[PDB]
Amino acid sequence: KYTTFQGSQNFRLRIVLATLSGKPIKIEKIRSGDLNPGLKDYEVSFLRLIESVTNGSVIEISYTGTTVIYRPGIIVGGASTHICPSSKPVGYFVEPMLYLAPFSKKKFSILFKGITASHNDAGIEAIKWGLMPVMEKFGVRECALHTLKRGSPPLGGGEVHLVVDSLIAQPITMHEIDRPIISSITGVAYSTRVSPSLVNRMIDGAKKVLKNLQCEVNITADVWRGENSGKSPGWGITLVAQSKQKGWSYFAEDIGDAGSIPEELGEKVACQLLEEISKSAAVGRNQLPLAIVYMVIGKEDIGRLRINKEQIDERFIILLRDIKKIFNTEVFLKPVDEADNEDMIATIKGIGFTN
Amino acid sequence: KTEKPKKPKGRAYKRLLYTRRFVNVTLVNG
Amino acid sequence: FGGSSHAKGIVLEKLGIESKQPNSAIRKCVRVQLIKNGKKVTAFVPNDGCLNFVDENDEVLLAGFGRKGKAKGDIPGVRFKVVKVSGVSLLALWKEKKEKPRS
Amino acid sequence: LHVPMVDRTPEDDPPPFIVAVVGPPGTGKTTLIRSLVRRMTKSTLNDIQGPITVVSGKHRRLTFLECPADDLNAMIDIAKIADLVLLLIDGNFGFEMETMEFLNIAQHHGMPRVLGVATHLDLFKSQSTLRASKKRLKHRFWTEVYQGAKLFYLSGVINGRYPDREILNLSRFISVMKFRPLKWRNEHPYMLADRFTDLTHPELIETQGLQIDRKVAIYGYLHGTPLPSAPGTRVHIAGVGDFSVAQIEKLPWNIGKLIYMDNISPEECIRRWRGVDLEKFVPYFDTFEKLAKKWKSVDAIKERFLSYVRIVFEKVPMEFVKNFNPKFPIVMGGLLPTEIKFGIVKARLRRHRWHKKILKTNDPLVLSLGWRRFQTLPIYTTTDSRTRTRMLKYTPEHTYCNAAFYGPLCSPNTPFCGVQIVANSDTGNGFRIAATGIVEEIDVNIEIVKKLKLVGFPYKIFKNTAFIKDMFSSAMEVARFEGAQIKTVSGIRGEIKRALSKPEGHYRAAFEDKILMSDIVILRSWYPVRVKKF
RNA sequence: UCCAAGGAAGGGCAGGCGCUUACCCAAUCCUAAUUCAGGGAGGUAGUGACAAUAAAUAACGAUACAGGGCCCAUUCGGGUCUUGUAAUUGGAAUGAGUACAAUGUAAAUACCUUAACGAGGAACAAUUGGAGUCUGGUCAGCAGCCGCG
């Protein structure tokens, strides 16, 4: 109620961190100057999802929608099913619920219906391959995303079953101070309602670019045909660079729309992937808030994450400012002793049960 | 802990047993 | 066992073992990791319940059953029994003759 | 293992060691304190200003605490923070059913190292029979309560008491033997007060009144996990209430600074440091011509493959100024997240040893949870089939309940002590111990069920063609429950057919046998009554 | 090690844990400025289930009610009836412990003795076990009818 925020900037993040913090917040003036003021459809529906997975929480919405009061409750969850609107895909809703996943008294078994792809939110295999082994690095033993059906834009028609089994009280402390060696590159190339050849043309679009390196590239052809392929046609491609010693990863995904080229799509995802390799020290910018948040809410000890100078953007700065506004926990960076790269080390006092 | 035994201690328990033994003995031999 | 008589250990969790006499009343089992060896050994607590006393995550003292292995009956393959939590000897907590420490 | 590890490292000589002298009011506790400090400072200081800082050199400084034996609160408050129990006993205790219940409090909340001290066994005993009585106490306490403590016997040399080798044995056991770690104590910041000053923002009509609270500066040393890390945190004052702190004082080109400087835009952080929203998860990249032509060659990642405090308060209100006193010791705690909340808590209980009553659900009970003492109505319930089908009226020797009540919530499942309150003139202990248990789990919005009983007594029954002679008087009731399933305590269910326009108890029903003539034919599952909130 | 800054000083020691130590020269002898007194010479108390030692927790009377009482073959059945429940109830006998005195006398502590007390079961408060086809309570899971743990 007293911790005040502005606009729709970081809406889901402040609801999630407000829930884990147990501190009531008040985000005001959301889209006051826009044409359709207040919350959108997906924001209201997401607040209904938070009302579903929690008990004792009270959310007040102003009649103009510009002012939102959030008092959280305890974390319960359970087995249910949510409908996603057409304005945002399912991965927009699978994105925040991974944060609250081990911290419940009952397992998260919620089925999801909605669109399974976009160009701005998270896809399926991005969450399955790029987030879930990384939360397995933080001490989660069993987590799984079960796609029953896929949905292409605009109509969608996908069902994904989200189940999280392992329940911990705080994350273990992480010490990642050295830049890992990537083992191999894999990926998924899927499609709905279309040819079994355009998948192979997307994988041609990957094989033109990733042929010069000395790691193996092994990408799976995934064609869905039938009722499992939803109502609309489409095709998507996702790439993951994996390191098998500690099991690190990087990913980049994109889908192809009507009239687009599959080979240029594959080259685009390949070049964004190598670009994400260059910009990195340990995790990707897509994996960055997961690691930062998981190191914040761990037990009371010092943890270290090796980050690169490219990964510090405005999103990271506003991220740590919001951590100081919510938990008041502060991270301090020390320059590494190497001169080959320009990395620096994140030092985190974990919160434990600090008030 | 139970309040069940009331039965005597030491010497008095051996006297009663002997008397009972003799009574039992009279029957079977006689 | 490693040949000795006892082993001191740590509760991880509390299972469920039931009975038929007098009716369906729960007889339970507990899960204890060995301190000295790391092997994970189950045990049984012979009494009316007494699951209530012990806790999750505390220090127990395991003990043999006395048959050279050879689980007693319809409890499935459980070979060891519990004597002391926190050094204060469950049977003494059973009557009322002690009160348990803080942990 | 790490909870003991956080405690010992900052602890050194200005953090004292906690020692309490607990005992009956009649015996010379104060004399033992004076002769004890007679060893520390040179030979002659026999004046009590307790609590005071006892500078016992640069190796280990200590602080000593006594509390009277009639105070109900601080007897509890001293028990959880201690590191050494020093008990003074008389030649007249041991089956005194009303003076020695605090032993159970120190038993349950965390026992430190304990001591028996016998002093009045010389004015009372004169013969060789004191040796068997001392060994009899060794059979009772403390050798039976803990194996590994020493029962001391000292001469009765009241005021005029010795400085000689016996308090070199006492200061041997004090000086040498250290403390065992207490688990839930060392996860909290907690501090004893030493000095106490009252700052009133000098005299005005907005300085004194009916409602005026002033700036209290309090002074002490730290214990446990560190409290000074941030201003404006929370705290508990024992006996008074929970508060926040206003201001705490402590007396024992760089991007990492520019990010926390919130007068700077983040593009000026990037701009100064060298040279848009998380609702888009997929990160920013440049154009396909720039990433494609830039990434025609892949050589750039070829290595990428194989102490003292001065604490400020705006509290407490004016009525506690009129409760000012010599410092009968006051301790500060620290509350945590998921414990500042309220909620319904489910906790396992049992009945207490050396207690002589039973506990109905309507008598409120005084509960000690961590640092907080709260009066709450303890509504009990039991399951009988791994699901609840009843509640109970008072917790017996027969069964041992699952108690539920509403107050502050406590997630980490702390041990749980329950005192029945008495007045200052009822027993000889300020409380008497009702029950003890553990917080089992936290659960808001739960609903107890009590199954009542509508009564029908059978007399002459057959299976299919079944009436009850005496069970009801309204026909429309049976018209509403004709779609239901009735019972008997024997266990052969029935299903009512039709009311048949006889509201006299007689009406036709169903049973899957013929219910017998020493049975009781009933109906189940009644109104799920609420929880008393207090 | 101390320092007033000139200088002055002790020899790295015992003792304890890890497996709380006091009193007295009354005797023996030694010394004595010695028929005085002294002795870190000497003598006298603290410490106790791995063990182990004796024996207390009751003894003797009396009456009215009452008997399908006990043993062997788990059996089918047979042999032998001397039995207990009631304060019905009464007098005996004692020391565990309470206490002057004296002996002991290193001054002296304990020990060898002792007048004075002191029982009808709440007593003056033994136990660790073991079985038992015994008595009780709302539990898979349900019908055409009767149940099971």
Curated annotation (Swiss-Prot), chain A:
Tell me one Pfam family matched here: RTC
What Gene Ontology cellular-component terms does the record carry?
90S preribosome; nucleolus; nucleoplasm; small-subunit processome
Query: Do you know which PROSITE patterns this protein is assigned to?
Result: RTC
Q: Which GO terms describe its molecular function?
A: enzyme activator activity; RNA endonuclease activity
User: Does the keyword section mention Acetylation?
Assistant: yes
Q: What SUPFAM superfamilies does UniProt report for this protein, alphabetically?
A: EPT/RTPC-like (SSF55205)
Compartments annotated for it: namely:
Nucleus, Nucleolus
Principal localisation: nucleus
Q: Which InterPro entries match?
A: RNA3'-term_phos_cycl_insert (IPR013791), RNA3'_phos_cyclase_dom (IPR023797), RNA3'_phos_cyclase_dom_sf (IPR037136), RNA3'_term_phos_cyc (IPR000228), RNA3'_term_phos_cyc_type_2 (IPR016443), RNA3'_term_phos_cycl-like_CS (IPR020719), RNA3'P_cycl/enolpyr_Trfase_a/b (IPR013792), RPTC_insert (IPR036553)
* Coiled-coil annotated residue ranges, if any: none
Kindly state which keywords UniProt assigns to this record, in alphabetical order: Acetylation, Nucleus, Ribosome biogenesis
What's an example GO BP annotation here? Answer: regulation of rRNA processing
Family to which the UniProt record says this protein belongs = Belongs to the RNA 3'-terminal cyclase family. Type 2 subfamily.
Q: How does it assemble?
A: Interacts directly with BMS1 and the U3 snoRNA to form a stable subcomplex. Component of the 90S small subunit processome also known as 90S pre-ribosome that consists of the 35S pre-rRNA, early-associating ribosomal proteins most of which are part of the small ribosomal subunit, the U3 snoRNA and associated proteins.
Which NCBIfam families does the record associate with it? Answer: 18S_RNA_Rcl1p
What function does this protein fulfil? Does not have cyclase activity. Plays a role in 40S-ribosomal-subunit biogenesis in the early pre-rRNA processing steps at sites A0, A1 and A2 that are required for proper maturation of the 18S RNA. RCL1 activates BMS1 by promoting GDP/GTP exchange.
Anything else known: Present with 10000 molecules/cell in log phase SD medium.
Curated annotation (Swiss-Prot), chain B:
Task: List each coiled-coil range.
Answer: none
Tell me the compartments it is located in. Answer: Cytoplasm
Sorted keywords for this record are: Cytoplasm, Phosphoprotein, Ribonucleoprotein, Ribosomal protein
At the top level, the lineage of the source is Eukaryota
Which sequence positions carry the modification called Phosphothreonine? 26
Question: Which GO CC annotations does the UniProt entry carry?
Answer: cytoplasmic stress granule; cytosol; cytosolic small ribosomal subunit
Protein name, UniProt field: Small ribosomal subunit protein eS30A
Which organism is this entry from? Saccharomyces cerevisiae (strain ATCC 204508 / S288c) (Baker's yeast)
Q: What is the lineage of its organism?
A: Eukaryota, Fungi, Dikarya, Ascomycota, Saccharomycotina
Question: Which gene codes for it?
Answer: RPS30A
Which residues of the full-length protein are shown here? 23 to 52 of 63
From Swiss-Prot, chain C:
Q: Where does it localize?
A: Cytoplasm
Its Gene Ontology cellular component terms are: cytosol; cytosolic small ribosomal subunit; ribosome
Chief subcellular location equals cytoplasm
Task: List the GO biological process terms.
Answer: maintenance of translational fidelity; maturation of SSU-rRNA from tricistronic rRNA transcript (SSU-rRNA, 5.8S rRNA, LSU-rRNA); regulation of translational fidelity; translation
* Function recorded in the entry: Component of the ribosome, a large ribonucleoprotein complex responsible for the synthesis of proteins in the cell. The small ribosomal subunit (SSU) binds messenger RNAs (mRNAs) and translates the encoded message by selecting cognate aminoacyl-transfer RNA (tRNA) molecules. The large subunit (LSU) contains the ribosomal catalytic site termed the peptidyl transferase center (PTC), which catalyzes the formation of peptide bonds, thereby polymerizing the amino acids delivered by tRNAs into a polypeptide chain.
Summary of subunit composition and partner proteins:
Component of the small ribosomal subunit (SSU). Mature yeast ribosomes consist of a small (40S) and a large (60S) subunit. The 40S small subunit contains 1 molecule of ribosomal RNA (18S rRNA) and 33 different proteins (encoded by 57 genes). The large 60S subunit contains 3 rRNA molecules (25S, 5.8S and 5S rRNA) and 46 different proteins (encoded by 81 genes).
Give the protein's recorded name. Answer: Small ribosomal subunit protein uS12A
The species this protein belongs to is Saccharomyces cerevisiae (strain ATCC 204508 / S288c)
From Swiss-Prot, chain D:
- Manganese found in the keyword field: no
Positions of ATP binding: 23-30
One GO cellular component from the entry? mitochondrion
For the region G3, what residue ranges are annotated? Answer: 66-69
Where is region (G2) located? Answer: 51-55
Q: For this entry, list what GO says about its biological process.
A: endonucleolytic cleavage in 5'-ETS of tricistronic rRNA transcript (SSU-rRNA, 5.8S rRNA, LSU-rRNA); endonucleolytic cleavage of tricistronic rRNA transcript (SSU-rRNA, 5.8S rRNA, LSU-rRNA); endonucleolytic cleavage to generate mature 5'-end of SSU-rRNA from (SSU-rRNA, 5.8S rRNA, LSU-rRNA); maturation of SSU-rRNA; maturation of SSU-rRNA from tricistronic rRNA transcript (SSU-rRNA, 5.8S rRNA, LSU-rRNA); regulation of rRNA processing; ribosomal small subunit biogenesis
Residues of the region (G4) are 119-122
Coiled-coil residues are none
Tell me which residues make up the Bms1-type G domain.
Answer: 15-180
Chief location of this protein within or outside the cell:
cytoplasm
Single Gene Ontology MF annotation: mRNA binding
Q: Does the keyword GTP-binding apply?
A: yes
Keywords noted in UniProt: ATP-binding, Cytoplasm, GTP-binding, Hydrolase, Nucleotide-binding, Nucleus, Phosphoprotein, Ribosome biogenesis
Please list where the region (G1) is annotated.
23-30
Q: Where in the cell is it found?
A: Cytoplasm; Nucleus, Nucleolus
Region feature (G5): 154-163
Please give the family membership noted in the entry.
Answer: Belongs to the TRAFAC class translation factor GTPase superfamily. Bms1-like GTPase family. BMS1 subfamily.
Complex and partners: Interacts directly with RCL1 and the U3 snoRNA to form a stable subcomplex. Component of the 90S small subunit processome also known as 90S pre-ribosome that consists of the 35S pre-rRNA, early-associating ribosomal proteins most of which are part of the small ribosomal subunit, the U3 snoRNA and associated proteins.
**Protein name per the record:** Ribosome biogenesis protein BMS1
Residues shown, of full length:
54 to 1014 of 1183
